[PDB]
Design a protein around this ligand. Structure first.
Ligand SMILES: [Fe+3]
Ligand SMILES: [Fe+3]
Ligand SMILES: [Mg+2]
Lengths: 480, 464
């Protein structure tokens, strides 16, 4: 009823909190008639006002959106993920859990509960929808009704208390390749590489130890290795008692890259070391023999201003991430990299690939671009987190193109859809939410993947603006 | 999925069509904590693009909104009324029924089906929600889930094929007082005065004939009489054959006022005649002995030419004791163009003085790419006050809530949706009924603009 009038809950970040349905969205243009599948997507949307006036973006309850493609039509369905947190807070009619990653600020009635909001990523696997949040197990939902089944441990087999929100689909085995940090609770170095079969059975859970008490948000998977990028985004329980941000970036410590053979154990894990930097989302990773490549935006400090870290304001220029390839060789001796190479010279994040080529050699990528030289005429919005541009890069040529959403709009994470199962790499479509911050409408815009610069070929016009979310995924109807 | 690019489906009249819920709406100010009940409300919202690009606003599928008040909180729930039309069209994934009230344009697959959209009014009665559209039976829904149960003939008793969307609640008996026109199908002169008990049982269905086939949208109920305003808004099968709009107003025919004793029959009905004009919604009606008063906006032509469409709240007076068919009085009650009148319905059918209305203030700026004013009139003194919503907003039909059961007439709150046509958000504004010029005392802030609707009603939780 009464949300704190902090910027975190006002203007373009106002609460939405509407579950609902639209049958047959209004289309401007023509939805590609062959497309038949689901595009899932999630945003934080605190059900009730927070205990803390300062409660953060990534702490809001997960609101899941479904866009079902079929017969040149798109349907809309949106539901709260009914996490243990969400269920108990609804019964109380108020928020019971506290600050971000801080159980010391929880109400006494919910101590020991799973504090996850399932607000970071949603992906179809094993005929179900996996709703994910780092600090908590995987939440199982129905891909079409968006009903919540409950957290899972994969029939008692998984020991890890947590489950990452950035798994990859092995394009050969169809296995869900995931991982977990803090696998034995907050502030533990216990890690795990996880593979889930196409029918939901836990196949392997390879434990190992991390170099830091740090955040491990994303990782890479190659044909033979799991790739873990370790940054000094450090955590400490002292900070929670002082009521400071759980994570704080240390600009003096180095970064590591851990290569775990997917068929080995912690004994075979080799650590490589490089200079200090901030590592973003992994576009893709792949190995050529013992040569391992991983592509991700690299910046000098935190790239997300909604992500409150401790110490040293928010440097918006030091937070500019550029798509960078890291290369190590398992055949070499020592912990030296072979190569670091900037792949793209514009600040970017939220990278995407033709997922048929995940874990393999590839050339086509899409990304959100921060074009600060463009006007932004929408009052009530952070100019910092303004992804106003969609970009495409041909890594084989370095050529790139982009599209500007205009001065009224932001763009959310894109997603690639192939034109057909055996279409060439990157031949198909890119979809993304384009949010008009003046009229408060959202379009699910459809681009030609190879000509994003020509603007959308179609727009699914929603009569509502979807709150800025995180990650989404496309699944063909055959996966259901 | 491809709606026409006409004005009736673009801009502020864009399709909405979202069913959904919000628990604990954002509140600016304070929702009066005593309030515990429901505000229902409905707008047209075609589920699929129409068969004809010039489809009327009034032809769209009914979308019902629920605002459940409790303990200073308001929850939101919005659902489609699952009429026979809506169900079959969803099955087919496209619009099967054709032009407004024109069965000659329906697809063959739905011929003889009920063409109602239930898009005009929603009112709690006998523990259920009555969803109404003139050309069709009453639709029964659940007041809290907004589930649909189906059309009703009240246990097979009701003979009328139709059921009005403007019933009044008798403040003494608790009966739902309704009527029906075209009761034996389209273009039929058959009429009926209807009463439904507080438990849903049909108590009386009094048939009579209408002076001609015309729109009979609203009517009045007094302590002793039912009051039927007849204007020459005509329709014939011939109009439908030429694919003209169903209704066509005739400037040369007179208007009638038919007074029917509630406990009598068609032989006891008296017709009074007056000059040509266009009649609008009924604020209220009452009788003082044999003198019958009815207050309603009156204009020269359709208000539902902007100058001819200017309707002014007017009182019509006839005397049942008199001989002949002359009125006694016609008196303009308000000098500003107005519509959607409302009263403290605890005084419905009885003498009253407090009314609320929407006012079209043409001297105000509108900065969007129009009811912009909420009014209050004290009929005992002619005094009035109003509130302008600003250059970006419009106001939908208001509705009165008494501060308490024993409160004096007009003592309480007036609620209405206020729509920002630039930011595309809607607020459920709460005013003090006696000081609407002071602006809202509270705003329930929706993260969406509710489409332009029709009629809504308040019901205390005790009625659930
Ligand atoms: Fe992420
Ligand atoms: Fe009406
Ligand atoms: Mg739109």
């Amino acid at each position: 009823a009464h949300f704190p009038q902090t910027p975190g809950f006002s203007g373009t970040l106002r609460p939405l909190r509407i579950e609902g349905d639209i049958l047959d969205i209004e289309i401007e243009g023509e939805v590609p008639p062959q497309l038949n599948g689901t595009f899932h997507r999630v945003h934080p949307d605190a059900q009730f006002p927070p205990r803390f006036e300062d409660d953060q973006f990534f702490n809001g309850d997960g609101m899941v959106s479904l866009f079902r493609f079929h017969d040149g039509k798109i349907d809309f369905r949106q539901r709260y993920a009914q996490t243990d947190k969400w269920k108990v807070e609804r019964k109380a009619g108020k928020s019971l859990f506290g600050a971000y990653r801080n159980p010391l600020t929880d109400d006494a009635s919910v101590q020991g509960m799973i504090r996850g909001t399932a607000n970071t990523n949603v992906m179809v696997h094993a005929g179900k929808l996996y709703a994910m949040k780092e600090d908590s197990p995987c939440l199982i939902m129905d891909p079409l009704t968006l009903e919540t089944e409950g957290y899972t441990n994969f029939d008692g087999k998984l020991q890890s208390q947590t489950f990452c929100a950035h798994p990859k689909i092995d394009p050969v085995t169809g296995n869900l390749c995931a991982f977990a940090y803090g696998a034995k609770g907050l502030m533990t170095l216990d890690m795990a590489y996880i593979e889930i079969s196409p029918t939901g059975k836990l196949l392997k859970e390879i434990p190992f130890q991390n170099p830091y008490y740090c955040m491990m948000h994303d990782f890479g998977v190659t044909e033979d290795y799991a790739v873990f990028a370790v940054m000094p985004l450090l955590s400490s329980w002292d900070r929670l008692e002082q009521r400071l941000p759980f994570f704080g970036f240390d600009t003096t410590l180095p970064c590591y890259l851990g290569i775990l053979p997917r068929n080995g154990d912690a004994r075979d894990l080799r650590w490589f070391k490089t200079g200090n930097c901030f590592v973003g989302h992994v576009m893709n990773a792949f190995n050529d023999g013992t040569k391992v490549h991983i592509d991700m935006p690299v910046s000098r400090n935190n790239s997300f201003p909604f992500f409150d870290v401790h110490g040293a304001p928010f440097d918006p220029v030091a937070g500019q991430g550029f798509l960078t390839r890291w290369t190590v060789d398992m055949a070499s001796n020592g912990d030296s990299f072979e190569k670091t190479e900037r792949l793209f010279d514009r600040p970017d994040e939220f990278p995407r690939i033709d997922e048929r080529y995940a874990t393999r050699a590839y050339r086509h990528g899409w990304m959100l671009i921060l074009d600060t030289e463009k006007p932004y005429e929408a009052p009530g919005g952070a100019f910092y987190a303004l992804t106003n541009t969609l970009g495409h890069i041909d890594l084989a040529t370095g050529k790139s193109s982009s599209w500007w959403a205009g001065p009224r709009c932001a763009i959310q994470e894109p997603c690639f859809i192939p034109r057909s199962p055996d279409a060439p790499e990157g031949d198909g479509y890119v979809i993304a939410l384009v949010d008009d911050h003046v009229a408060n409408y959202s379009d699910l815009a459809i681009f030609d993947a190879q000509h994003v610069d020509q603007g959308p070929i179609a727009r699914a016009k929603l009569p509502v603006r979807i709150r800025q979310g995180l990650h989404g995924n496309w699944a063909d109807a055959s996966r259901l």
